[PDB]
Nucleic acid binder design. Structure first.
Ligand code: DCP
Ligand code: CL
Ligand code: CL
Ligand code: MG
Ligand code: MG
Ligand code: NA
Ligand code: NA
Ligand code: NA
Length: 327
DNA sequence: GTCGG
DNA sequence: GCTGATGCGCC
DNA sequence: CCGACGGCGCATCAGC
């Protein structure tokens, strides 16, 4: 039981319908902003009107909140749940590497279930095949206890490649979450800055060492600065194995560490809303820089940054600890 | 879907 | 190959 | 067919 749990689950469910079925990404974003502001609200919502006062709730969402508050359900969602087609499209998007577009296509050709995907593996790309192979594993959360073991493995192996590397586990882990959806690792090295890429293969050396020791087991995508893949803790004899887990590693210029760690710590909705506040203050924020906004459209050169807090400072936000950036 | 130019 | 658009994903 | 909305890495396709 969470305070306005009913409402936020309804809106979250509709968000996912819009993104996955209607391919209406802004409606997705609207529903999520509403869910977010309502989850922050410290009172029980008693009407649509009350909700309408909040930023990002308008007429239509207020009417839905009135309906749900009177009846305990939403007709629109009942119909969507009874629609086999919608339900298949939505389910398939949960496979890593099947987005809304591929899900729709698969369903159009009558591929609607996990069994159907295994029968039509030849229709899937490498990434999708891996998402399917570990589907059950990727559904499951990682207890913090395991995240700590995984961190120890990563930091130790990284140190063995070169002790000038610094690896920081971000995402929900950094936000103090008791369980995590995956492992996000921010990487820096003194040879890679906004000025110069001096050393080649900097990210590659880490990935290959983590592969050598059989921690990283599969690669979904890979470039010079981002690794997206799979890893697994070692297990003991006749102990059942650990689930395979999703891992993301991001290599950021050392001199842009605070912008990177801010981005990688999230949450996602926090980030979008911090970046949104930046815009209405005449700045733009990415994982590399905070820049002031001109007029021609263009951003100006990066502003100096010496902490996560300095970024909040530019935009008139009081600092938020990582744990206070979750939903 | 909402908000604001 | 390029530029630009799309589809996958990340926080 | 009021348009903006947060921003970008990697992979792949279109029209050169
Ligand atoms: N668990 C199973 C069952 C059957 N098959 C085989 C038999 C067929 O050669 C092919 C599937 O053909 P179907 O058209 O029966 O499979 P569909 O998934 O299309 O049938 P449905 O309409 O029931 O979804 O795969 C399989 O690989 N695995
Ligand atoms: Cl939309
Ligand atoms: Cl920085
Ligand atoms: Mg994560
Ligand atoms: Mg996430
Ligand atoms: Na409102
Ligand atoms: Na997916
Ligand atoms: Na991740």
């Amino acid at each position: 039981e969470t305070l306005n749990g009913g409402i936020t689950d309804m809106l979250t469910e509709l968000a996912n319908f819009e993104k996955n079925v209607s391919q209406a990404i802004h409606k997705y974003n609207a529903y999520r902003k509403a869910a977010s502001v309502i989850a922050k609200y410290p009172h029980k919502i008693k009407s649509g009107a009350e909700a309408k006062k909040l930023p990002g709730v308008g007429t239509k969402i207020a009417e839905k909140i009135d309906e749900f508050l009177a009846t305990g359900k939403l007709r629109k969602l009942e119909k969507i749940r009874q629609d086999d087609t919608s339900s298949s499209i939505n389910f398939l998007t949960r496979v890593s590497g099947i987005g809304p577009s591929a899900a729709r296509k698969f369903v159009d050709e009558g591929i609607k279930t996990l069994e159907d995907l295994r029968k039509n593996e030849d229709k899937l790309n490498h990434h999708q095949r891996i998402g399917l192979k570990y589907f059950g594993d990727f559904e499951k959360r990682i207890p913090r206890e395991e995240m700590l073991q995984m961190q120890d493995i990563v930091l130790n192996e990284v140190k063995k490649v070169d002790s000038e590397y610094i690896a920081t586990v971000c995402g929900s882990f950094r936000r103090g979450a008791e369980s995590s959806g995956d492992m996000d690792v921010l990487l820096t090295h003194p040879s890679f800055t906004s000025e110069s890429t001096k050393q080649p293969k900097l990210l590659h050396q880490v990935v290959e060492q983590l592969q050598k020791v059989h921690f990283i087991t599969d690669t979904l995508s890979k470039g010079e600065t981002k690794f997206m893949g799979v890893c697994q803790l070692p297990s003991k004899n006749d102990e059942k194995e650990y689930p395979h887990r999703r891992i993301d590693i991001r290599l950021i210029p050392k001199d842009q560490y605070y912008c990177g760690v801010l981005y990688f710590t999230g949450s996602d909705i926090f980030n979008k809303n911090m970046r949104a506040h930046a815009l209405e203050k005449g700045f733009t924020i990415n994982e590399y820089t905070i820049r002031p906004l001109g007029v021609t459209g263009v951003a100006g050169e990066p502003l100096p940054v010496d902490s996560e807090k300095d970024i909040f400072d530019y935009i008139q936000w009081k600092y938020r600890e990582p744990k206070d950036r979750s939903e």
